[PDB]
Write a protein that binds this ligand. Structure first.
Ligand SMILES: [Mg+2]
Ligand SMILES: [Mg+2]
Ligand SMILES: [Mg+2]
Ligand SMILES: [Mg+2]
Ligand SMILES: [Mg+2]
Ligand SMILES: [Mg+2]
Ligand SMILES: [Mg+2]
Ligand SMILES: [Mg+2]
Ligand SMILES: [Mg+2]
Ligand SMILES: [Mg+2]
Ligand SMILES: [Mg+2]
Ligand SMILES: [Mg+2]
Ligand SMILES: [Mg+2]
Ligand SMILES: [Mg+2]
Ligand SMILES: [Mg+2]
Ligand SMILES: [Mg+2]
Ligand SMILES: [Mg+2]
Ligand SMILES: [Mg+2]
Ligand SMILES: [Mg+2]
Ligand SMILES: [Mg+2]
Ligand SMILES: [Mg+2]
Ligand SMILES: [Mg+2]
Ligand SMILES: [Mg+2]
Ligand SMILES: [Mg+2]
Ligand SMILES: [Mg+2]
Ligand SMILES: [Mg+2]
Ligand SMILES: [Mg+2]
Ligand SMILES: [Mg+2]
Ligand SMILES: [Mg+2]
Ligand SMILES: [Mg+2]
Ligand SMILES: [Mg+2]
Ligand SMILES: [Mg+2]
Ligand SMILES: [Mg+2]
Ligand SMILES: [Mg+2]
Ligand SMILES: [Mg+2]
Ligand SMILES: [Mg+2]
Ligand SMILES: [Mg+2]
Ligand SMILES: [Mg+2]
Ligand SMILES: [Mg+2]
Ligand SMILES: [Mg+2]
Ligand SMILES: [Mg+2]
Ligand SMILES: [Mg+2]
Ligand SMILES: [Mg+2]
Ligand SMILES: [Mg+2]
Ligand SMILES: [Mg+2]
Ligand SMILES: [Mg+2]
Ligand SMILES: [Mg+2]
Ligand SMILES: [Mg+2]
Ligand SMILES: [Mg+2]
Ligand SMILES: [Mg+2]
Ligand SMILES: [Mg+2]
Ligand SMILES: [Mg+2]
Ligand SMILES: [Mg+2]
Ligand SMILES: [Mg+2]
Ligand SMILES: [Mg+2]
Ligand SMILES: [Mg+2]
Ligand SMILES: [Mg+2]
Ligand SMILES: [Mg+2]
Ligand SMILES: [Mg+2]
Ligand SMILES: [Mg+2]
Ligand SMILES: [Mg+2]
Ligand SMILES: [Mg+2]
Ligand SMILES: [Mg+2]
Ligand SMILES: [Mg+2]
Ligand SMILES: [Mg+2]
Ligand SMILES: [Mg+2]
Ligand SMILES: [Mg+2]
Ligand SMILES: [Mg+2]
Ligand SMILES: [Mg+2]
Ligand SMILES: [Mg+2]
Ligand SMILES: [Mg+2]
Ligand SMILES: [Mg+2]
Ligand SMILES: [Mg+2]
Ligand SMILES: [Mg+2]
Ligand SMILES: [Mg+2]
Ligand SMILES: [Mg+2]
Ligand SMILES: [Mg+2]
Ligand SMILES: [Mg+2]
Ligand SMILES: [Mg+2]
Ligand SMILES: [Mg+2]
Ligand SMILES: [Mg+2]
Ligand SMILES: [Mg+2]
Ligand SMILES: [Mg+2]
Ligand SMILES: [Mg+2]
Ligand SMILES: [Mg+2]
Ligand SMILES: [Mg+2]
Ligand SMILES: [Mg+2]
Ligand SMILES: [Mg+2]
Ligand SMILES: [Mg+2]
Ligand SMILES: [Mg+2]
Ligand SMILES: [Mg+2]
Ligand SMILES: [Mg+2]
Ligand SMILES: [Mg+2]
Ligand SMILES: [Mg+2]
Ligand SMILES: [Mg+2]
Ligand SMILES: [Mg+2]
Ligand SMILES: [Mg+2]
Ligand SMILES: [Mg+2]
Ligand SMILES: [Mg+2]
Ligand SMILES: [Mg+2]
Ligand SMILES: [Mg+2]
Ligand SMILES: [Mg+2]
Ligand SMILES: [Mg+2]
Ligand SMILES: [Mg+2]
Ligand SMILES: [Mg+2]
Ligand SMILES: [Mg+2]
Ligand SMILES: [Mg+2]
Ligand SMILES: [Mg+2]
Ligand SMILES: [Mg+2]
Ligand SMILES: [Mg+2]
Ligand SMILES: [Mg+2]
Ligand SMILES: [Mg+2]
Ligand SMILES: [Mg+2]
Ligand SMILES: [Mg+2]
Ligand SMILES: [Mg+2]
Ligand SMILES: [Mg+2]
Ligand SMILES: [Mg+2]
Ligand SMILES: [Mg+2]
Ligand SMILES: [Mg+2]
Ligand SMILES: [Mg+2]
Ligand SMILES: [Mg+2]
Ligand SMILES: [Mg+2]
Ligand SMILES: [Mg+2]
Ligand SMILES: [Mg+2]
Ligand SMILES: [Mg+2]
Ligand SMILES: [Mg+2]
Ligand SMILES: [Mg+2]
Ligand SMILES: [Mg+2]
Ligand SMILES: [Mg+2]
Ligand SMILES: [Mg+2]
Ligand SMILES: [Mg+2]
Ligand SMILES: [Mg+2]
Ligand SMILES: [Mg+2]
Ligand SMILES: [Mg+2]
Ligand SMILES: [Mg+2]
Ligand SMILES: [Mg+2]
Ligand SMILES: [Mg+2]
Ligand SMILES: [Mg+2]
Ligand SMILES: [Mg+2]
Ligand SMILES: [Mg+2]
Ligand SMILES: [Mg+2]
Ligand SMILES: [Mg+2]
Ligand SMILES: [Mg+2]
Ligand SMILES: [Mg+2]
Ligand SMILES: [Mg+2]
Ligand SMILES: [Mg+2]
Ligand SMILES: [Mg+2]
Lengths: 146, 97
RNA sequence: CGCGGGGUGGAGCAGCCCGGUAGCUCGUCGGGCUCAUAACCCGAAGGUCGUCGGUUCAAAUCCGGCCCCCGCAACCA
RNA sequence: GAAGGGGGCCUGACUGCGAGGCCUGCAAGCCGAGCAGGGGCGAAAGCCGGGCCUAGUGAACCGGUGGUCCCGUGUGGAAGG
RNA sequence: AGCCUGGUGUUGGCUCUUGGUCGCGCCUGCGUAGGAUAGGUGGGAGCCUGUGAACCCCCGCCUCCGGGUGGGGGGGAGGCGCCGGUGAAAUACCACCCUGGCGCGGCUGGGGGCCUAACCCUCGGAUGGGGGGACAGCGCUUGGCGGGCAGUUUGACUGGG
RNA sequence: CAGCGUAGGGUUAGGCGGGACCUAAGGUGAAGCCGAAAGGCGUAGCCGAAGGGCAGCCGGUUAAUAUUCCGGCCCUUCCC
RNA sequence: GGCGAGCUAGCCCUGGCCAGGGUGAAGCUGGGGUGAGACCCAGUGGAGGCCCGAACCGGUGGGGGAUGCAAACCCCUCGGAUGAGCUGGGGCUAGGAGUGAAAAGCUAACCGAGCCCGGAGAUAGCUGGUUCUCCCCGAAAUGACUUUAGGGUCAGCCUCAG
RNA sequence: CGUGGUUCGUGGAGCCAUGGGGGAAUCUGGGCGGACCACCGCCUAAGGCUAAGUACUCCGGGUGACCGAUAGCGCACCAGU
RNA sequence: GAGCCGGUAGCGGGCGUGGAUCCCUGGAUGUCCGAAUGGGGGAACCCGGCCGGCGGGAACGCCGGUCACCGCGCUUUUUGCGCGGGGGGAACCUGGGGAACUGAAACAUCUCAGUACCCAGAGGAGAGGAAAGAGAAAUCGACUCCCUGAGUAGCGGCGAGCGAAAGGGGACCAGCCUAAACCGUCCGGCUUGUCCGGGCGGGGUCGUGGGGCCCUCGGACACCGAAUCCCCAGCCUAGCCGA
């Protein structure tokens, strides 16, 4: 008989794989141990509903990046720093690149997880990357003076 | 009380027929009956312990309608009573109308 | 009548498989050891291998018809 | 004056019937001329429907087997009769 | 009736181990005899190898141990047959199959061990713990033993029976 | 004449016996188990006595009752 | 299908009963005995499906009774009588069932399967019985077959009508 | 598979019912017309209710080629005594 | 409409035309037991809880009221409340069970017989009933009941025996509600959703197949109409006139 798994097993499938097994097994082990439930017409319906819910609120999360990827991956922000010469007195941190972009084009980012690794000194044209999952490379120019 | 709590199958009365001789459809002169006597046929009654709400409930059912117990267990809706949830799980939830 | 086996020499009986020794024991005879017979040793007797017809180079083999003994299993107005 | 013994061909140890009788409580049992079909032996007349005769036997029911037309449960079949 | 018993339901997990059938794959087989240790019959002037041959060395299995046979490789251009024949047959090869064997999968069957969680027992204590355990019990069904019980039968003639 | 017919009368208890106490075999039986129906089981509980428990002895009196009425002496429980 | 253990059988609970006499086990004490013992002797003691014998429980032999006093009695005689004893009260077990120190005994005065009502007007090839009158005729007791033989079917013999 | 019902006693045994095992489909679905198959037809299972025509006579009444006290009810009467 | 206080006279008293006895309808009272129901119990007896009353009344006793169990429904398992059940009835009815004698001139299948009887349940009746029907006619149309079909068809140790249906003639006459798709709603579960589930409402009920949903037509005053409620006639439960 077919049941809906509520957990990975090895010996069957995982978290939603409708697989059939001995009714004895179902009644006296799985069901009692919350290990799963019966492939009811109801439970089966509620499962499709389960699958669509995710597939939506998930393919929407990717539709949040692919969107914020475009407005960001091409537009550039400027970081004017007391640069002295090819060696900033201070230093632009990820925390800074955040504040900056918030006005220089007016968006908000992490500012954590930005592939920042160690505050950036010196000047030049940098290309970093962002998140979450399939992501975007942000470009920015650290300049000079005020 | 050897009756299924779900289907209502209860023991019936049936004859045990002692026949001998070779079938007619096998070139025999035909079958002969050396006795007919009454006997009961009981439904294949079994226990089904199933946990419902907070309580353990035990159905005496024909093996045939065991599935029905678990279907009756799916229907859940507010009931913190005594070991007498079956009173509610029973015909209340069977066919009702 | 139904199903399965086969009769091989005087007896049971291996060869019935992947078609090819037509064997072993007791009995009797010949011969020696034994004071002796038996034991025991040497050799030897007897098979168209149930019936006939077939498939192969043959065949006890395989098929098929056939025949009873035994074997099995029901039925009996 | 064969029903006995011997030989030659043959299979009437036929099919379809059967006048009339014997016997007889019933049911049975028995004898039987003659007609027809197709035969056997005989030159023929003819004889032949087992055996010199009188015992060697078993109603019905239930089934088996081979035929054959016959019936075939809406119909064609089939099952089964 | 009772008792024994196969199948099946209640009845689950994990394994090891086997059988039948089927498909496919690879081997399997011996009579001097032909030059041989060629299973039945066909097709068959062809081949096989430079998509690395024979000659050898580890290797496994089969064996009438004679040899059969692939794998690893040194190996580097040969290696078979018909032909001729003291043999029913011809023995490169492509085949369809027979007998039996292993191998892989398929549909099924048998056994053994372990597990626990149904089912059973038990624990002043339980949503639990311990023991037994998919056995036993119980349902349906099979066949059997079955004066423990039940219903009956157990002839007539006859100088009484 | 009667144990017979008709009629009238006669049986007096806080302490005697039993009950507003206890439990026994057994019976019944919330829980629970089983059985075609009837019903059968069954823990507690309840019922159940010639057992356990519990306070009255001596006289007088009536045609007929008396540890019951009376007399004397003596006790029980309940309520305040 | 019900009614019965108020008789009887067994068992369960709670009570009660057994005059009087006899025999004198163990143990105990003391004495003897021995290396120490076994053991022996006294006295004490008071055991027992022990003895005699009433109540009580029986029912051995004989007589009587026999339309009885009595549907199990009476007389004489006899058995047990501290035990597997007797007995009151309260309970439980039953009809193919109970109970039985076992006779097929007992389960309400007849038990090889209780009683009551019912199926029921069981069945009875057997037995008995079968009722006013007159008139005419008038048999059979054989054969065949029959789990048939004292019962039947056909025939035979009687009668009536055409 | 095991049985019951029907006239159907296993029969060629359908149909309706169902104790056991297995176990669908939703009009192009399903059941039936007596094994089975085809064809042609009939009907829509697994939910329920439904007057009247029918059965009976404790009870009241009306009738009798019904009884008339051994009859008629067991009881004509203080009898289920 | 003149007599009455039963059978039942009597003793000893009373009542009636101001309408008695008597008859019909309704009401009141109705000890105790009994389904018996506060609890016991060897029916007609015994013993209690709670509220109230009576006696001098705390102890005691009496009076009124109330208190069994089970089911269903509400409702907060609270705890209550409401509703109902229980038992009886001559026969009749349905269901669950279910013999034997006997017959077969023995006997087992068969018969007796689904009888007797036991049990449950129902009601003035009960059952049954609106085709997954019949069964050969392009047929009939719920069910019950009678006549017939018919001792037919068949069944059967093919023995004993058992024994239909269609069809025809009559009696009576009737047909409906739902489940599901779909829609609305309240609620509960949660692994929060065009999610699942339960509860109510709408919707829908059919065999020339029906229904849902979408579109178009035109969808209505109507028209049919209860088995339910209401009214009435009529009828029953006393009587009266009557040559
Ligand atoms: Mg059987
Ligand atoms: Mg045949
Ligand atoms: Mg019988
Ligand atoms: Mg099943
Ligand atoms: Mg001659
Ligand atoms: Mg001649
Ligand atoms: Mg003649
Ligand atoms: Mg003759
Ligand atoms: Mg002769
Ligand atoms: Mg016969
Ligand atoms: Mg025949
Ligand atoms: Mg025949
Ligand atoms: Mg024809
Ligand atoms: Mg027909
Ligand atoms: Mg036909
Ligand atoms: Mg035939
Ligand atoms: Mg024929
Ligand atoms: Mg088994
Ligand atoms: Mg099993
Ligand atoms: Mg295998
Ligand atoms: Mg191939
Ligand atoms: Mg365990
Ligand atoms: Mg455990
Ligand atoms: Mg364990
Ligand atoms: Mg088992
Ligand atoms: Mg058996
Ligand atoms: Mg047997
Ligand atoms: Mg006997
Ligand atoms: Mg026997
Ligand atoms: Mg008999
Ligand atoms: Mg005799
Ligand atoms: Mg004589
Ligand atoms: Mg004599
Ligand atoms: Mg007097
Ligand atoms: Mg006093
Ligand atoms: Mg006294
Ligand atoms: Mg007292
Ligand atoms: Mg008091
Ligand atoms: Mg008490
Ligand atoms: Mg009881
Ligand atoms: Mg009870
Ligand atoms: Mg009950
Ligand atoms: Mg008391
Ligand atoms: Mg007392
Ligand atoms: Mg006392
Ligand atoms: Mg006292
Ligand atoms: Mg005193
Ligand atoms: Mg006196
Ligand atoms: Mg005195
Ligand atoms: Mg005094
Ligand atoms: Mg009885
Ligand atoms: Mg007694
Ligand atoms: Mg005394
Ligand atoms: Mg003494
Ligand atoms: Mg001493
Ligand atoms: Mg001394
Ligand atoms: Mg003394
Ligand atoms: Mg002494
Ligand atoms: Mg004595
Ligand atoms: Mg003595
Ligand atoms: Mg003496
Ligand atoms: Mg004595
Ligand atoms: Mg004496
Ligand atoms: Mg005497
Ligand atoms: Mg005597
Ligand atoms: Mg005597
Ligand atoms: Mg005498
Ligand atoms: Mg005498
Ligand atoms: Mg005398
Ligand atoms: Mg004496
Ligand atoms: Mg004693
Ligand atoms: Mg006693
Ligand atoms: Mg009896
Ligand atoms: Mg007995
Ligand atoms: Mg005795
Ligand atoms: Mg007696
Ligand atoms: Mg009778
Ligand atoms: Mg008789
Ligand atoms: Mg005359
Ligand atoms: Mg004369
Ligand atoms: Mg006779
Ligand atoms: Mg005659
Ligand atoms: Mg004349
Ligand atoms: Mg069947
Ligand atoms: Mg039948
Ligand atoms: Mg038969
Ligand atoms: Mg037949
Ligand atoms: Mg049938
Ligand atoms: Mg049948
Ligand atoms: Mg059919
Ligand atoms: Mg069926
Ligand atoms: Mg079924
Ligand atoms: Mg169709
Ligand atoms: Mg039909
Ligand atoms: Mg047909
Ligand atoms: Mg079949
Ligand atoms: Mg139809
Ligand atoms: Mg319907
Ligand atoms: Mg009705
Ligand atoms: Mg009347
Ligand atoms: Mg008169
Ligand atoms: Mg009289
Ligand atoms: Mg009389
Ligand atoms: Mg008179
Ligand atoms: Mg009467
Ligand atoms: Mg009388
Ligand atoms: Mg009277
Ligand atoms: Mg009076
Ligand atoms: Mg007067
Ligand atoms: Mg006056
Ligand atoms: Mg007036
Ligand atoms: Mg009144
Ligand atoms: Mg009143
Ligand atoms: Mg009471
Ligand atoms: Mg008060
Ligand atoms: Mg009161
Ligand atoms: Mg009622
Ligand atoms: Mg009733
Ligand atoms: Mg009752
Ligand atoms: Mg019935
Ligand atoms: Mg009945
Ligand atoms: Mg019932
Ligand atoms: Mg029945
Ligand atoms: Mg009988
Ligand atoms: Mg008869
Ligand atoms: Mg008879
Ligand atoms: Mg007879
Ligand atoms: Mg007899
Ligand atoms: Mg019958
Ligand atoms: Mg009744
Ligand atoms: Mg009526
Ligand atoms: Mg009605
Ligand atoms: Mg109905
Ligand atoms: Mg309908
Ligand atoms: Mg229709
Ligand atoms: Mg026939
Ligand atoms: Mg019948
Ligand atoms: Mg008709
Ligand atoms: Mg008609
Ligand atoms: Mg109509
Ligand atoms: Mg919803
Ligand atoms: Mg709805
Ligand atoms: Mg609705
Ligand atoms: Mg509606
Ligand atoms: Mg449509
Ligand atoms: Mg007048
Ligand atoms: Mg007048």
């Amino acid at each position: 008989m077919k049941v809906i798994l509520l957990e990975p097993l090895e010996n069957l499938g995982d978290v939603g794989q409708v697989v059939d097994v001995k009714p004895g097994y179902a009644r006296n082990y799985l069901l009692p141990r919350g290990l799963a439930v019966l492939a009811t017409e109801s439970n089966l319906k509620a499962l499709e509903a389960r699958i669509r819910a995710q597939a939506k609120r998930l393919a929407e999360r990717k539709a949040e990046a692919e969107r914020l990827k475009e407005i960001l991956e091409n537009l550039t922000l400027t970081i004017p720093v007391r640069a002295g010469e090819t060696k900033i007195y201070g230093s632009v941190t990820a925390k800074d690149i955040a504040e900056a972009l918030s006005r220089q084009h007016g968006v908000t980012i992490d500012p954590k997880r930005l592939a920042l690794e160690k505050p950036i000194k010196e000047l030049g044209e940098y290309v970093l990357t962002y998140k979450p999952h399939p992501e975007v490379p942000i470009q920015l120019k650290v300049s000079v003076v005020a | 009380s050897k009756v299924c709590e779900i289907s209502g199958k209860r023991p019936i009365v049936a004859n045990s027929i002692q026949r001998r001789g070779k079938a007619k459809r096998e070139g025999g002169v035909g079958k002969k009956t050396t006795g007919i006597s009454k006997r009961r046929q009981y439904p294949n009654l079994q226990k089904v312990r199933v946990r419902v709400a907070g309580q353990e409930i035990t159905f005496r059912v024909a093996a045939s309608h065991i599935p029905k117990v678990y279907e009756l267990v799916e229907r859940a809706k507010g009931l913190k009573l005594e070991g007498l949830s079956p009173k509610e799980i029973k015909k209340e939830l069977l066919k009702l109308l």
